[PDB]
Symmetry: D2
Subunit: 246 residues, 4 copies
């Protein structure tokens, strides 16, 4: 090849929770860099909308419903990718959720964070790995959170499931490296998405003095899933303007 | 000397043998009354008996820490017997090397046993520690929570979640006067292969269970009163592999 | 796309060979006018000439980064050549394994060359980058700044100082519009190493490298291009480890 | 207890006041013959005299830790007075917030004082520790070694160097019978100027709701230099009430 290694020409990319925000920028970006994209979401309307806009833009995409915590949903996506495009070379695990919860929280909540943030993406990684190997190499990207490394009040379930996403990333890179597969994570800072007094106090400890755009994350994501990052694996890259947003 | 647990009540889980037993023994001799727990209660009872024989206050219970009934029984049984809970040592856990393509039940059990169990106990134990004007939680983690290897997907990531849970709940239970810390212990002896195990261990010897109990005592004592949210690696300066 | 250095002026230090040289060539390809620097001026001149012949803009200059007059000379010369400074890559550095009982001068020298030099050049470059409305500084650190081992008192601690300096001065120069990041390369098969490297040493180095290869100079240059481009407009204070997933011990 | 310094000879630098003084007094009480060091000799001997009264053994010497002739004189004074060296607490240090554009002399000085000095004294002590069949080195670092703020170029980066040096020389000196550890103290309420709303601010992210005491650190120092930590080496122990004091 003679194109820059910053493209995904030939690639096939599953992006989860991609109807809005970071996930949506990743889907559009991966497509414009030459990937055929499988957009998934909890609501298929949002997923299909994203896929259609990609198709409109010149790229190749399909849009699907996926509850990443549902086994038959996870397997359906894997099947749909191969049926449509014939291989899987990139997995972006962007689906997740949760937030401040009190210490005394119900035990169904604590277990939910791990079900949602961890178990889903680990399983999705097991499912994709065999196919990426057959394709002769892949990249997995986990969208984690800065809470995975920060410490604060009300963060028992969210902070600890994210810290777990970080370390699974660092360890499975050992498992799947010999299969040709790289595994990294991005910890995004606060993303300005859909009150200019609260903004000045969100950015009190942010050196670059602005909120993120979803496109900042997607740029970092494209680098990390591209051949320009071919020798990078097991890494957690924090994209937050140099500090913490609160 | 603030390195003594005089007037203290400590639950110590998975404490039949190994690290948990040496911590149960040591805290007892440190001045504390000990609710020893274990999967198999003949293991638990034996340790409790040997403490009483040595001249200390203790009781031994069966507890499968992944059982909400077993968990609450331990709390009640601590309270009936000794009148309060002041120290909780989460030593029960398990797992190890497992292939990347393990069954999901294997993966989930790692979290159930190593993480879910100890987070509940902490919740259960906490209000009583507050009611006692303060306390200390101590989690026995693993170096796998910090290190990176092959076959470590479930065991490494769950021990990593335990470390960061420790750092974060220190913020929640801090205002309740509770301190939360963890220990990551190296390879514990509890001749040819031993030289090779020691290849990246600067102190040139394998661990003793007591080494861990010594650090456990410091952290759970008033001499570490302004220590919270920490993960202390006790491994002679390196990794045993 | 956002991966180009259109209109940029980059100083790349210690850049006659290896990682420095791949960064200089790649930044020039990406659109930057490049001031290639090296202890040996003929070496820097050679890379600048290749950049020029490949259809790019570059000069090569002598520079001992530990010499205050060389540093300021370099800064003035980049401004005399191209009118502004928007990118600084602090690739010059050195040192390695040293006994615990090493003379103090060995220990201090690791800081002088690895840390004091790149701190001073960042100071000198910063007000120029602010006048040009934006900058990126990139420090080439090392995995030794994170790992622990025998014979690393001066090399490891000096590189850990680089990593943390990077995290901290990000706070200082972010309000000037400057981003500061570092790369910590693992073992990179340059022609310095590839000559010395035996197949059986290489195998020991691959033992704990999940990707099954040593790195190439271009791996580092690609990472460096990302980190100094618009594609990383919102990344500062980071240390990106490029190590193929593990360690090369 | 295993938390005693019986038969120990401990050198403690910067010990006229604050943390250094408390470590010295505490080490004496735990059985150590203490060599008390300070920039001002009258301060060093004041701590030494006080110790001698309360029932321990301590000499007081003047020492600028950045001066080789001084460093060597403490070493010799300890051997002459007590016959051996088994423990070294490198507590002497300094610096703090500095502007980015600081003169190089200031940047370089943070290293001469916080790092070059403790490394040299470790070099000097180590042979006498080996000849005595073991010892412990304790570096007093700072939370600046790990945290990130404005104005921390010289101070933060020198303390990070201290931390990583501790991790690394643990390897060089462990086969000599020597452990090397560090303490990163938070804000410690020594005799040091602090107002009510300043202190309230520092407590905002301290979970335990109090600043620390010199004795908090001394206790941790005692643990780390005692046989109860005989298998602990290369560690950085943060004593900070569970959070940060900023």
């Amino acid at each position: 090849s003679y194109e820059s290694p910053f493209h995904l020409n030939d690639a096939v990319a599953i992006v989860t929770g991609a109807a809005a925000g970071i996930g949506r920028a990743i889907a559009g970006t991966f497509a414009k860099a030459g990937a055929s994209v499988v957009v998934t979401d909890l609501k298929s309307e949002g997923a299909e909308a994203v896929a259609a806009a990609i198709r409109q833009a010149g790229g190749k995409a399909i849009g699907l419903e996926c509850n990443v915590t549902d086994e038959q949903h996870r397997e359906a996506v894997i099947k749909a990718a191969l049926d449509q495009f014939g291989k899987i070379t990139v997995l972006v695990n962007n689906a997740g959720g949760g937030g401040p919860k009190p210490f005394d929280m119900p035990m169904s909540d604590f277990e939910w964070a791990f079900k949602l943030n961890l178990f889903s993406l680990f399983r999705l990684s097991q499912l994709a790995a065999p196919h990426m190997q057959k394709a002769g190499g892949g990249a997995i990207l986990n969208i984690s959170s800065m809470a995975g490394e920060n410490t604060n009040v009300r963060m028992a379930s969210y902070g600890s499931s994210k810290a777990a996403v970080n370390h699974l990333t660092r360890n499975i890179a050992f498992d799947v490296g010999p299969m040709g597969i790289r595994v990294n994570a991005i910890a995004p800072g606060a993303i300005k998405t859909d009150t200019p007094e609260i903004e000045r106090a969100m950015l009190k400890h942010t050196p670059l003095g602005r909120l993120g755009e979803a496109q900042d994350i997607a740029n970092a994501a494209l680098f990390l899933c591209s051949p320009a990052a071919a020798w990078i694996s097991g890494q957690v890259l924090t994209v937050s303007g140099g500090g913490v947003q609160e």
